[PDB]
Write a protein that binds this ligand. Sequence first.
Ligand SMILES: CCCCCCCCCC(=O)OC[C@H](COP(=O)([O-])OCCN)OC(=O)CCCCCCCCC
Lengths: 171, 87
Amino acid sequence: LQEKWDRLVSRFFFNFACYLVYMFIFTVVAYHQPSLFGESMLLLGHILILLGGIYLLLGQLWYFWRRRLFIWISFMDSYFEILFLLQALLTVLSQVLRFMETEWYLPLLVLSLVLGWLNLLYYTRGFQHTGIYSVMIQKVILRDLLRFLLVYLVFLFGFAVALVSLSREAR
Amino acid sequence: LLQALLTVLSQVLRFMETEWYLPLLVLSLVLGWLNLLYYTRGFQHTGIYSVMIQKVILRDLLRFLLVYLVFLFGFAVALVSLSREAR
Ligand SMILES: CCCCCCCCCC(=O)OC[C@H](COP(=O)([O-])OCCN)OC(=O)CCCCCCCCC
C-alpha cells in the first residue's frame, strides 16, 4: 500500500489542486454577488460553479452506487463523501434557486461555501502529521461533545425558561 | 542575525528620512526582546523550560494555525457575503 500510495500521490495532489481552484472560483463569485464585462464574468463563474457541482454530484452518486453497503458498515470512514455529496447538491440547488430568482439562493450558497471549506480537511490525510491529527477530530472527541451538548442544551433550555419567567415582573 | 540587520536597516531609513524607519525600529525592539530567551539556557530550570517552547508545541501550533486559518477565512467570506442584504 505504501508503493501504491507513492505511485498515486501525484494524482492525489492533482485532485487537491483542482478542488482548491474550484473553491477559489466559488469563493470569488460568492464574494461578488449582486444585490437581490463584470456581469459576463460573473455569469461565467456561475456556469463554472454549476459544472463543478454537477461533476461532484455525479462522482459522489457513482461512489454511493458502487459502495452502498460501506455507509452501513462504517460511518466513520464514509462521512466526508457524504459531505462531498451534500454541499454538492447544495451547489446545484442554490443555482436552481438562482434560476427561479427567489430569496433563499444566497443562504444556500453561503452554506455551500462553508461546507466546502470544511471539506478541505479530507486532503489533510495526504500528510502524516495532519493525517494523525484528523483521526482525533471525529473519533474520540465526537461522542463526548455530543453528550456534553445534550446535557448543556437541557440545562440551557431550563435556565432560559427560568430567567424568562422570573424577569417579567417589574420593580 | 535578522533583527541585527533590521537594527542596521531602520537606521539607513533614518538617514534617508523616510516614513518606515519607525516600524522597522519597533520590530527590531520586539525581536530583540524575544531574543533575550537565549540566555535562559544558562539556568537549568529555564533551560529545560526553553526546550518545550520550540520542539513539541511548535508543530501542533502550525497545524492548528493552518486549520484555523482555513476555517476563519471561509467563515469570514460567508459572513461578509451574507450580511450585505439589509432588512
Ligand atoms: C468541462 C468538463 C471537464 C470534466 C473533467 C474535469 C477535470 C477533472 C476534475 C477532477 O480531477 O476532479 C477531481 C476533484 C477531486 O475529487 P475527489 O475524487 O478527490 O473526491 C474525493 C471525495 N472524498 O474534484 C473536483 O475538484 C471538482 C472540481 C470540478 C472542476 C474542475 C476544475 C479543474 C481546474 C483545473
